[PDB]
């Protein structure tokens, strides 16, 4: 009985890590941050509505300049948006209309777009030739791609639907590091400001810490009861929040590897498709399937306000890198920007 | 505003015009979600490296058809099947020469019960409450020489019927068309075809014609 013995000792050391997480805690975040001043009503009206899509939008991403945002949809068009003046900077056609991820490079020279075709396409934006053309056809994933965040101008981290994350290159097109350890399809990804660790979200309610340089998990997060659909990373670098499909958002710890706080209400039932922070870290934007978003007081677990105004379900939202505004994409072919 | 901003918004207006004129093409494109069991006969209806969605296109009687096969995708179905709100109709290809052999690779269930589970999963979705089905029950030519040697009751202990073509075919129609929880919104269009038969593209055209008629009654406030 080798398999039974190894399984039972693996379960014993799983109870060991669970008891370590329990005994390391002393107090919850409620009874030490309930004595501070609450955040008032965050009444943020929409300012720019980036109309022009003719299909449902699954992905948007801001830039380091906090002015240009790109958006991917099932119209076959990847559109870069001048958010200040409501202007279409570019309209990148796609060889596959089935895309659910997009990312704008920190250098601003590249944009990613992938999806159900299981191929990551990276487009070179600022070229001497005046057009946008694809640079590399990143292939090797056996599942559907879900997130394609740019590590830098030369490395991209792509999470696919075959329980694997990967780190790619540009000059070669091969997989430098393959991440294994999930049992469900990965649906979210979020990098770090120091760019050394990234968290993932799979279909088995498991969130890991895949380091970049050597490429293995650091700790496992299993607190949700449904699949984790969206993930986002705290600006300090010691926390991250997950948005699952059971009307719960929850923070974690990069170093204490324990549950901090849950963000749920009796009214909200549907799941979360998009979650993001503010650059101060107190507001937690979260997009639901009730055709609206919400701002969450991360230190109080209190709904600080609603962001209603979208006709269809919001699937993607991100804030600017200077914390100026939040742009909430949705399935109504609209891009509302709130401030 | 500046002259550079004027040229920028002129470029944006040109991009909007291009988006309008190539989204105008999306009306004539009739999208079909072709899916089914592995080696269930879905290959023989499209005869007449991506490792993702197989993309094919054909036209007939001034109507553009795109068949969106997801047979090469082995991920969890429920987290990407919500992308197909705007599909015109669903192509469900299951064979009839599959009742006797159970899986031919593993031993858990039969092909017919797998088709039942797939059709039950695709019929009760929140995303597919109104999409019509052009369900194809193919490989009926090889079904009759396989129904004489082995009866249909070896997999169905509730049949108790005559072992022939018409009775087994009618029981197949009844057992595929009863899984719809709302027959007042979606009528399954069962059809028979073979490898060397006439064109079923006429039946496909009639079905998508009915779906387009339903959409035309929908958007004019008369449905």
């Amino acid at each position: 009985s080798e398999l039974d013995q190894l399984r039972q000792e693996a379960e014993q050391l799983k109870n060991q890590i669970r008891d370590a997480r329990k005994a390391c805690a002393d107090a919850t975040l409620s009874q030490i941050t309930n004595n501070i001043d609450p955040v008032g009503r965050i009444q943020m009206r929409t300012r720019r509505t980036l109309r022009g899509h003719l299909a449902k939008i699954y992905a948007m991403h801001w830039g380091t300049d906090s002015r240009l945002l790109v958006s991917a949809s099932q119209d076959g068009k990847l559109i870069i948006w001048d958010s200040y003046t409501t202007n279409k900077v570019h309209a990148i056609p796609l060889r596959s209309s089935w895309v659910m991820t997009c990312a704008y490079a920190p250098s601003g020279n590249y944009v990613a777009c992938g999806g159900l075709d299981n191929i990551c396409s990276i487009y070179n934006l600022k070229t001497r030739e005046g057009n946008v053309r694809v640079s590399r056809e990143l292939a090797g994933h056996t599942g559907y791609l879900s997130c394609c965040r740019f590590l830098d101008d030369n490395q991209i981290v792509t999470s696919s639907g075959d329980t694997t994350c990967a780190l790619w290159d540009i000059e070669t097109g091969q997989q430098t590091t393959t991440f294994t350890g999930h049992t469900g399809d990965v649906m979210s990804l979020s990098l770090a400001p120091d760019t050394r660790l990234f968290v993932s979200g799979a279909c088995d309610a498991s969130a890991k810490l895949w380091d970049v340089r050597e490429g293995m998990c650091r700790q496992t997060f299993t607190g949700h009861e449904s699949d984790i659909n969206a993930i986002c990373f705290f600006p300090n670098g010691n926390a991250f929040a997950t948005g699952s499909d059971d009307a719960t958002c929850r923070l974690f710890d990069l170093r204490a590897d324990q549950e901090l706080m849950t963000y749920s209400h009796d009214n909200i039932i549907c799941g979360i498709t998009s979650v993001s922070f503010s650059k101060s870290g107190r507001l937690l934007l979260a997009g639901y399937d009730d055709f609206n978003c919400n701002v969450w007081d991360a230190l109080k677990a209190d709904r600080a306000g609603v962001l209603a105004g979208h006709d269809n379900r919001v699937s993607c939202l991100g804030v600017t890198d200077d914390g100026m505004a939040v742009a909430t994409g949705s399935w109504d072919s609209f891009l509302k920007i709130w401030n | 505003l500046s002259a550079e901003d004027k040229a920028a918004v002129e470029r944006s207006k040109m991009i909007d015009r291009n988006l309008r004129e190539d989204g105008e093409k999306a009306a004539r494109e009739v999208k079909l979600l072709l899916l089914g069991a592995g080696e269930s006969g879905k290959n023989t209806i499209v005869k007449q490296k991506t490792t993702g969605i197989v993309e094919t296109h054909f036209t007939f009687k001034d109507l553009h058809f795109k068949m969106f096969d997801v047979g090469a995708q082995r991920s969890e179905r429920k987290k990407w099947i919500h992308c197909f709100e705007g599909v015109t109709a669903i192509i469900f290809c299951v064979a009839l020469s599959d009742y006797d052999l159970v899986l031919a690779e593993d031993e858990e269930m039969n092909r017919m019960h797998a088709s039942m589970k797939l059709f039950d999963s695709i019929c009760n979705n929140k995303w597919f409450t109104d999409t019509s089905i052009i369900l194809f029950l193919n490989k009926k030519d090889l079904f009759e020489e396989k129904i004489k040697k082995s009866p249909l009751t070896i997999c169905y202990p509730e049949y108790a019927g005559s072992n022939t073509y018409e009775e087994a075919a009618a029981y197949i129609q009844c057992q595929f068309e009863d899984l719809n929880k709302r027959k007042d919104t979606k009528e399954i269009y069962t059809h028979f075809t073979c490898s060397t038969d006439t064109k079923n593209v006429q039946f496909v055209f009639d079905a998508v014609t009915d779906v387009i008629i339903k959409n035309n009654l929908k958007d004019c406030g008369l449905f």
Partner: single-chain antibody
Amino acid sequence: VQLVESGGGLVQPGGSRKLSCSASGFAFSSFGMHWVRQAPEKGLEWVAYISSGSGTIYYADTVKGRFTISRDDPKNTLFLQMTSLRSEDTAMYYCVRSIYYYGSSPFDFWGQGTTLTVSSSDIVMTQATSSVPVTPGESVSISCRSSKSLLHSNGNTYLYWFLQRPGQSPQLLIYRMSNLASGVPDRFSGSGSGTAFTLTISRLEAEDVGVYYCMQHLEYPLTFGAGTKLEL
């Protein structure tokens, strides 16, 4: 990227010609073309402008109603038709690409140029200095002056810097306040605020000599600066 001019030559006074540019090797349909001429005894002057897809047309005041500009996107050609041209139009004409969006670099590429010889409230830029004696490896800082302010409401200065090498086409050098074009080494620095404008070069090389020019892109027409040639 190629902008090869064609046609032209010696013409009788009061006649007509057709300046055609085979603008091939690049996406011609996404670039707003221009037309800049240069008198043999004077500097550069812009004469015409066509936007992408013939959306917007602008002309110089000297050639308005006398010059015809036209383009055809499938054939990748930019035309320039002049009728009853005067001896004041005796110059060599350059075709210029210009794309316009956020962060774009207008006036990026120029043509070789074909000579045209005739037989027998505008924001202007002034550069009084010319034929500046410089030494290689040293630092020089030329200056440029504008008639009015160039800081628009959207917080940027629309000033363009160029470099015309001897026997060569002008090249884009600095295309706003304090930013660098593509292919220019990280040596040419731009600065200045309001109407006082300047350039900055760290260590001059052998190919850095030539005549430098200014340009505003705030209102039309698009008149240049003066000669700012450098000498060894």
